Design a binder for this molecule. Structure first.
Ligand code: HEM
Ligand SMILES: COc1ccccc1O
Length: 401
């Protein structure tokens, strides 16, 4: 596309460091645009992302780097009967009525455990010391990975993150950094070494862990789903389900620190925490551009005539800064009117864990503000955000008296 010649000079590193300037141009110039370094069309506005995610002429497709990492059948990349089975498999523990039965006794003692390690120090780095551990310990226990240390769960989602966002392609459309997939392969090998013995045991002795239920639920007597059939969805969980609640917590905190009067409001009135989190997810979406859809017939989107079989990356983190929807979207504002947002996606492949994720984040922040009401940002240490596919702060240094 001639007027988008400048996109030829956009780099993967630029998008990872801060994608918002490029995507501000894309939203104005070309809401659906082919980005050469990504080797794909990209949807940048709320209207186009929603249309693609919900269209009857599109279905799920995994990104190239996602496919190289997760294989088949990753719940995010399949459709039809297989997708319906995988959704039936994961949905029971995520049902709102079910989550409300046990989410408090799950998350609150975990939040207290990690808080007790530092709440009297007067300083902490909240990403590593609190947000990520609460996120991975809660979900890890739900899955049946109680014996997998939070440090290890966090290392796995970091490696899987970098692997499935290893999207850069060269002039010929081949991956520019094929060696970047090796650490994804290494994480999967380690995951297998840990989880294979657990699956062995769950096949013979089912329990209330989620992975045990993935093996057994809905199956004929004495049968389980083959481990190869569920492993890619295990990997999906060990990346985003482990990573995103902690990132959403942390981005919410960074935004509140950027509006000190709003931080004070929420500490004083913790019933405002759900609204603070919803704005945090819009303001810096944890899953920023990690999923995609593929057209199943010729379709015209945003004035582009796409052939059948065209992938489109859904850059939801950009759509959540759509100035057709939001005033001054790069500013965190607790008091923004509650509007629809796309941080959980849309359509048949929208996030299955929204209700759970929202409560994990709410409980973590409630406990944090109860334990340390006088939290302040360490204004010497600046907050760097990183990531194009998944985005969040790399650290969050705070102090308190
Ligand atoms: C704040 C935290 C989270 C955010 C922002 C988030 C966001 C998203 C997004 C954007 C997608 C892709 C939707 C699309 O392509 O349209 C997704 C998919 C998914 N998420 Fe969440 N997620 C979060 C936490 C979780 C958790 C904790 C779980 C599990 C307990 C989970 C389970 C899933 C599943 C299973 C899918 C695949 C859905 C499908 O393809 O059918 N998510 N999520
Ligand atoms: C819930 O985990 C994911 C969601 C979207 C893309 C990759 C993931 O691991």
């Amino acid at each position: 596309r001639p007027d988008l010649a400048w996109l030829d000079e956009v780099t993967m590193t630029q998008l990872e460091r801060n994608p918002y300037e490029v995507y501000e141009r894309l939203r104005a110039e070309a809401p659906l645009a082919f980005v050469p370094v990504l080797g794909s069309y990209v949807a940048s506005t709320a209207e186009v992302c929603r249309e693609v995610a919900t269209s009857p002429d599109f279905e799920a497709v995994i990104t190239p780097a996602g496919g190289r990492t997760f294989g088949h059948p990753a719940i995010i990349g399949v459709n039809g009967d297989i997708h319906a089975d995988l959704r039936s498999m994961v949905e029971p523990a995520l049902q709102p009525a079910e989550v409300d039965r046990w989410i408090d006794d799950l998350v609150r003692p975990i939040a207290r455990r990690y808080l007790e390690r530092f709440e009297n120090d007067g300083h902490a780095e909240l990403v590593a010391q609190y947000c990520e551990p609460v996120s991975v310990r809660s979900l890890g226990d739900l899955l049946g990975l109680q014996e997998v240390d939070s440090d290890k769960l966090r290392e796995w989602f970091a490696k899987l993150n970098r692997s499935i966002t290893n999207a850069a392609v060269d002039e010929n459309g081949e991956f520019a950094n094929p060696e970047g997939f090796a650490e994804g392969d290494q994480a999967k090998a380690e995951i297998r070494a840990v989880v294979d013995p657990l699956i062995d045991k769950w096949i013979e002795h089912p329990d209330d862990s989620a992975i045990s239920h993935w093996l057994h639920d809905g199956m004929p007597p004495g049968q389980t789903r083959d481990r190869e059939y569920i492993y890619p969805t295990i990997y999906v969980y060990l990346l985003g389900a482990m990573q995103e609640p902690g990132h959403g917590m942390a981005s919410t905190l960074v935004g509140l620190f950027s509006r000190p009067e709003q931080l004070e409001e929420v500490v004083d009135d913790p019933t405002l925490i759900p609204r603070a989190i919803a704005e945090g997810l819009r303001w810096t979406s944890p899953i920023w551009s990690a999923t995609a859809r593929i057209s199943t017939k010729p379709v015209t989107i945003a004035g582009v005539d796409l052939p059948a079989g065209t992938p489109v990356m859904l850059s939801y983190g950009s759509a959540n800064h759509d100035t057709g929807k939001y005033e001054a979207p790069s500013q965190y504002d607790l008091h923004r009117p509650p509007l629809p947002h796309l941080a959980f996606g849309a359509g048949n492949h929208a996030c299955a864990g929204i209700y759970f994720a929202n409560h994990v984040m709410r409980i973590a922040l409630e406990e944090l503000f109860e334990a340390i009401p006088n939290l302040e940002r360490d204004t010497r240490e600046g907050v760097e955000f990183w990531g194009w596919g998944f985005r969040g702060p790399t650290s969050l240094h705070v102090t308190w008296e």
